[PDB]
Amino acid sequence: MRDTLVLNAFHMNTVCHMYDGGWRNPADRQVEFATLEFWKEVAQTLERGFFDSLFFADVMGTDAAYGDSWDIYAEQGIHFPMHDAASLVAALIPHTEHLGLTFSSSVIQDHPFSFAKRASTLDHLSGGRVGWNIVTGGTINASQNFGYDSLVPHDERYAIGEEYMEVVYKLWEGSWDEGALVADKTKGIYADPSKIHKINHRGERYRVAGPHLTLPSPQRTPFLFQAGASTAGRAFASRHAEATLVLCLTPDSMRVAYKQMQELLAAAGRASDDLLMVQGMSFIVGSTEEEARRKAEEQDQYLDVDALAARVSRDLGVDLSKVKDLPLLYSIRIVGTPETIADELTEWRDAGMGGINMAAQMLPGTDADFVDYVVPELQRRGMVQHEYRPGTLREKVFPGRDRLLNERHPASRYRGIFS
Amino acid sequence: MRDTLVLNAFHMNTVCHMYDGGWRNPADRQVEFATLEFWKEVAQTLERGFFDSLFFADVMGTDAAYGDSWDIYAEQGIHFPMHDAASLVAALIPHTEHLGLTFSSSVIQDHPFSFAKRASTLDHLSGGRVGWNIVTGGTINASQNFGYDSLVPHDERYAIGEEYMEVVYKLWEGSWDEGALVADKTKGIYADPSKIHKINHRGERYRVAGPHLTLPSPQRTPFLFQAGASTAGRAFASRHAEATLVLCLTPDSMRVAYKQMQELLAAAGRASDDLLMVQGMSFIVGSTEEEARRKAEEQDQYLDVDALAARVSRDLGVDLSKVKDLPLLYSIRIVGTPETIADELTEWRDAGMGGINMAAQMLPGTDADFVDYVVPELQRRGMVQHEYRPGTLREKVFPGRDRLLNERHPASRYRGIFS
Numbered sequence: 001m002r003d004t005l006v007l008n009a010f011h012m013n014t015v016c017h018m019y020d021g022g023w024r025n026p027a028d029r030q031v032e033f034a035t036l037e038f039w040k041e042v043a044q045t046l047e048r049g050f051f052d053s054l055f056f057a058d059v060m061g062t063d064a065a066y067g068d069s070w071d072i073y074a075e076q077g078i079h080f081p082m083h084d085a086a087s088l089v090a091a092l093i094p095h096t097e098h099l100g101l102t103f104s105s106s107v108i109q110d111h112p113f114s115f116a117k118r119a120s121t122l123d124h125l126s127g128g129r130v131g132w133n134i135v136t137g138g139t140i141n142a143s144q145n146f147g148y149d150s151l152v153p154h155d156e157r158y159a160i161g162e163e164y165m166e167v168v169y170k171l172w173e174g175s176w177d178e179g180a181l182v183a184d185k186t187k188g189i190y191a192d193p194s195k196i197h198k199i200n201h202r203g204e205r206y207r208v209a210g211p212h213l214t215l216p217s218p219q220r221t222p223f224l225f226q227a228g229a230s231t232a233g234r235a236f237a238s239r240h241a242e243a244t245l246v247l248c249l250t251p252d253s254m255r256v257a258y259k260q261m262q263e264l265l266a267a268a269g270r271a272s273d274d275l276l277m278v279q280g281m282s283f284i285v286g287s288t289e290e291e292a293r294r295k296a297e298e299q300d301q302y303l304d305v306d307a308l309a310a311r312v313s314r315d316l317g318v319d320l321s322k323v324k325d326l327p328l329l330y331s332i333r334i335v336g337t338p339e340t341i342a343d344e345l346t347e348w349r350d351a352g353m354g355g356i357n358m359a360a361q362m363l364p365g366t367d368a369d370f371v372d373y374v375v376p377e378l379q380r381r382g383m384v385q386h387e388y389r390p391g392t393l394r395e396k397v398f399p400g401r402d403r404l405l406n407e408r409h410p411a412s413r414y415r416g417i418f419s
Numbered sequence: 420m421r422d423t424l425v426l427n428a429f430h431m432n433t434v435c436h437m438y439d440g441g442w443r444n445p446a447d448r449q450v451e452f453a454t455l456e457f458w459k460e461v462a463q464t465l466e467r468g469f470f471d472s473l474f475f476a477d478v479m480g481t482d483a484a485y486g487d488s489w490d491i492y493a494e495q496g497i498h499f500p501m502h503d504a505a506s507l508v509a510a511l512i513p514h515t516e517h518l519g520l521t522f523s524s525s526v527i528q529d530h531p532f533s534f535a536k537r538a539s540t541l542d543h544l545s546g547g548r549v550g551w552n553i554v555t556g557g558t559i560n561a562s563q564n565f566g567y568d569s570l571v572p573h574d575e576r577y578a579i580g581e582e583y584m585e586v587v588y589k590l591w592e593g594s595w596d597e598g599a600l601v602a603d604k605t606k607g608i609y610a611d612p613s614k615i616h617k618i619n620h621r622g623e624r625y626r627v628a629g630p631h632l633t634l635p636s637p638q639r640t641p642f643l644f645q646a647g648a649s650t651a652g653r654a655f656a657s658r659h660a661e662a663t664l665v666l667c668l669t670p671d672s673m674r675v676a677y678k679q680m681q682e683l684l685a686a687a688g689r690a691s692d693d694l695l696m697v698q699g700m701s702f703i704v705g706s707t708e709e710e711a712r713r714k715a716e717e718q719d720q721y722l723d724v725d726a727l728a729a730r731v732s733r734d735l736g737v738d739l740s741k742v743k744d745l746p747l748l749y750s751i752r753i754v755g756t757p758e759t760i761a762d763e764l765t766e767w768r769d770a771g772m773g774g775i776n777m778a779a780q781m782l783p784g785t786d787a788d789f790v791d792y793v794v795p796e797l798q799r800r801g802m803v804q805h806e807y808r809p810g811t812l813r814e815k816v817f818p819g820r821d822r823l824l825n826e827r828h829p830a831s832r833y834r835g836i837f838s
């Protein structure tokens with residue numbers, strides 16, 4: 001029932017999230033990420049653009065995969081410093097109203113009881129606007145920061161993933177049954193103890209008693225993002241995610257990738273339309289074609305090649321010591337007019353793109369310019385919403401639907417198992 | 420030279436924090452705790468009173484210990500449901516300007532890397548206003564909420580304690596040496612990497628590489644609350660705290676307890692000013708003495724005693740089968756006129772009380788009544804600040820001190836130990 005694209009901002013609580021070395025640009029303001037105010041302006045611009053969500057990536061780590069000198073990662077600010085996403089999201093509740101506030105928490109960096117209790121809390125406080133990107137790995141230092149030798153092997157990471165989701169759904173959906181809150185002052189019953197349960201979860205990595213500590217929140221289980229490119233991962237996204245964060249290079253790469261997920265969803269026991277493919281992207285924009293080309297010139301100066309190699313050389317492994325196109329493994333940039341950019345996005349949406357996962361070259365410039373110039377174009381073509389729909393982030397992304405996840409979704413299956 | 424009293428509100432992100440059963444009062448609104456708007460009004464009323472801080476308690480478990488079943492903890496809201504204070508402190512940042520925002524986190528609930536990184540992040544975002552009530556405790560359920568058969572014994576909680584603090588101080592004070600941020604775009608250096616170090620902490624319960632992930636923050640180490648009333652604990656608070664939350668039953672009790680701390684502090688290597696004995700209390704005011712006694716009748720109707728017993732029992736092991744003066748275990752009540760409540764609070768201050776730790780019987784009433792009636796009287800008498808002093812919460816509690824902690828404080832030991 002949703003004929004308009006989903007817009008999602010893809011930022012991270014660090015000086016330079018995307019287009020490495022781009023913190024140098026005199027016109028930039030990302031060096032301000034430490035303050036609440038910088039981000040308020042970015043949050044608000046986006047809600048002037050009717051963006052469905054703003055998403056904060058997050059790491060517990062920094063590593064020297066380039067050569068053997070961790071130098072350039074502090075010198076060019078490559079995902080270091082890293083500040084805590086969750087904390088900032090709470091800090092943005094008051095300076096937004098309908099904007100979805102999303103974040104990565106990983107599996108290693110917070111116990112699912114703690115992570116469950118925090119999510120529920122934010123979900124209450126935000127008024128049902130919380131997004132959760134499920135992360136299952138993290139780098140070496142990430143492990144060595146919570147005292148672990150080395151990484152647990154790739155696919156075990158997703159095994160562990162499943163139990164984490166086993167635990168949180170139990171807490172969010174299972175522990176409190178419907179009608180548990182009573183709030184009857186005269187009768188003297190706040191919460192109905194016959195409807196509030198332990199989980200007594202006992203598995204291979206997690207034991208947890210419960211009950212879950214929070215009142216049921218507006219969404220119960222926050223709006224679920226996952227970004228798994230691999231087999232064990234894509235599988236996981238197909239199983240649990242409401243929107244997967246993906247990076248196809250051509251629209252024909254999206255068409256393949258869409259078809260693939262559709263099969264995976266059917267095996268996972270879910271509808272074609274239960275999951276949005278959301279594309280990593282970025283934009284530069286102008287009135288003429290020449291203004292936008294000439295913007296990219298300006299912005300691409302401050303693009304450091306050696307620090308782009310430092311983020312590639314961690315991921316791929318290969319220690320590279322055209323090459324300038326490599327930020328196309330992180331977002332497909334589109335330069336041009338609003339008409340051009342809209343024209344090109346139509347190909348992607350036709351290839352199966354359900355949403356844009358928009359990153360920034362400069363902040364708040366990219367974000368401003370996309371809202372200022374592109375959003376009205378897309379709104380005119382009926383591709384981007386004119387106004388917010390009322391209700392929870394789930395209710396927004398999936399128009400017909402209930403504030404709670406569908407009966408097809410793994411979460412639903414926990415609803416009153418312990419009744 | 421801090422010559423006014425500290426005011427700390429002592430609330431908790433739950434329906435009935437403090438005068439058990441009191442959620443039932445038709446005048447009360449603590450049943451609205453789940454929403455940000457209730458707490459926005461509580462926070463703002465406190466800042467209008469010039470409170471130094473608002474403090475959120477937090478447990479990570481409810482327990483069975485009241486005989487047959489766990490029913491009376493649901494029905495009468497006995498520190499259940501329980502919502503995460505961290506998140507709420509972050510969501511009040513925008514609705515407050517100078518008010519200090521404090522929370523209990525415990526050892527058991529969060530690893531000292533994550534917790535360090537969340538704190539420092541909250542501390543940037545707040546702008547130097549974060550408090551940290553250190554908790555080494557835990558009810559049995561909270562242990563079983565993280566996969567542990569039973570409690571570790573009392574002595575060891577504080578041992579584990581001192582390591583956790585040994586880890587967090589390493590990250591907050593040790594890793595990033597002064598002049599670490601550079602931010603020079605012309606030059607192209609975000610952080611001097613010679614000044615950013617792994618902590619390489621390998622102790623009893625913990626291993627952590629670091630480095631810490633956040634830019635050094637205004638306070639660096641958040642402002643430190645501690646509550647340990649036992650041997651191990653006082654000794655712990657004497658060693659690490661800036662303000663200890665205590666429960667002295669009588670001013671004679673404070674005079675003794677204050678004397679004791681000053682020996683513990685001297686042994687702990689600290690000057691006598693370096694920590695504040697902040698007292699648990701609760702006021703009911705009126706314009707005559709008959710007005711305030713009349714209020715105290717009206718509220719105490721709704722004071723449940725069996726529920727009170729059930730919280731006493733959670734803490735002291737034994738399930739029960741005057742008794743209405745068991746609430747002197749949690750806060751000392753004063754009813755009367757503002758003349759009375761200032762006259763009486765002088766005695767406490769003269770016996771060594773450096774701040775009040777004010778809990779609510781109703782909200783927003785108890786706080787509003789204290790702010791509207793008592794505060795003006797204390798400001799007359801030079802007992803309570805007229806106007807917020809600029810700088811951090813450290814700088815607000817200790818006039819003319821640095822934003823950072825003193826060289827007499829354990830945290831300082833860690834400054835520089837890696838270059």
Ligand SMILES: Cc1cc2nc3c(=O)[nH]c(=O)nc-3n(C[C@H](O)[C@H](O)[C@H](O)COP(=O)(O)O)c2cc1C
Pocket residue numbers: 010056057058059104106133134135136137138227228229230231232233234245246247280357
């Ligand atoms: C758009 C996007 C955002 C991501 N954000 C994070 C993050 O915030 N934290 C993190 O540890 N990993 C992050 N990742 C890495 C993913 O969790 C994922 O593990 C990776 O893309 C490959 O998944 P796989 O586990 O299927 O190999 C992100 C990936 C993508 C594509």
Ligand SMILES: Cc1cc2nc3c(=O)[nH]c(=O)nc-3n(C[C@H](O)[C@H](O)[C@H](O)COP(=O)(O)O)c2cc1C
Pocket residue numbers: 429475476477478479523525552554555556557646647648649650651652653664665666699776
């Ligand atoms: C004012 C006050 C607030 C407290 N808040 C919390 C809290 O939020 N969470 C928690 O687990 N324990 C809390 N406690 C429990 C303390 O850990 C308690 O003082 C206990 O006695 C620790 O000292 P001990 O271990 O020496 O007995 C609090 C105690 C006091 C006095």
